[PDB]
Design a protein around this ligand. Sequence first.
Ligand SMILES: *[C@H]1O[C@H](CO)[C@@H](O)[C@H](O)[C@@H]1O
Length: 235
Amino acid sequence: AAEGCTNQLDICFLIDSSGSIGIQNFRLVKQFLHTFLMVLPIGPEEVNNAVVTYSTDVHLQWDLQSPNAVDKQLAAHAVLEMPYKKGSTNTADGLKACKQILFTGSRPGREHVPKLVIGMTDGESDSDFRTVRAAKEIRELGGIVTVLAVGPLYLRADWGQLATAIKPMLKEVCKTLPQDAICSDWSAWSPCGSQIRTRTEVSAPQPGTPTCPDCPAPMGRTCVEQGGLEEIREC
Ligand SMILES: *[C@H]1O[C@H](CO)[C@@H](O)[C@H](O)[C@@H]1O
């Protein structure tokens, strides 16, 4: 929301690879994703990323349960290796893929973390990124859908100025995302047996903006959810 946003995200990058993009513009998208992943706090406890390419059919590059989902350097290298497969623009099936990954394919702990779809497309499917039932379903499940059309959660950029869209895209997403509770720092370890330290919830979690009329938004982590208010060590 305002004042900030959570670090625990699941992001499915949905990349158009149609013939209306071309092998040239596809390389720009990959390099855009390369530097984009460089800015995101990619990590097992932070942001998890999945990448899906599509044209006539859907091509899963890697999902959230892959080692690339939690390693920044590993993931950044991989998006550059992504093969260009020409065809039509089957965004519908692509969104169904991101839906499957985000809501059924999470890492063991992260089923209820905020779900985010970042789609990149051209003049096509910009209105079908809202119209298609798959995108509607992601929204009513609490998921967030962002689209970058090249050539508020809808952004426009030209092929020569793609990277200029990164900062404003992060800006809009952070407003839609919830802010976790703000906890105090841990107290010193208590004397023994077993050592125990505590902390306080200074500010309450702030929910994010609903993605559609009257549909659920993530409520953000309480301090109890962010690792509890107490920790116990043994001596
Ligand atoms: C308590 O736990 C550790 C202590 O080193 C840190 O992650 C942090 O200071 C937290 O408040």
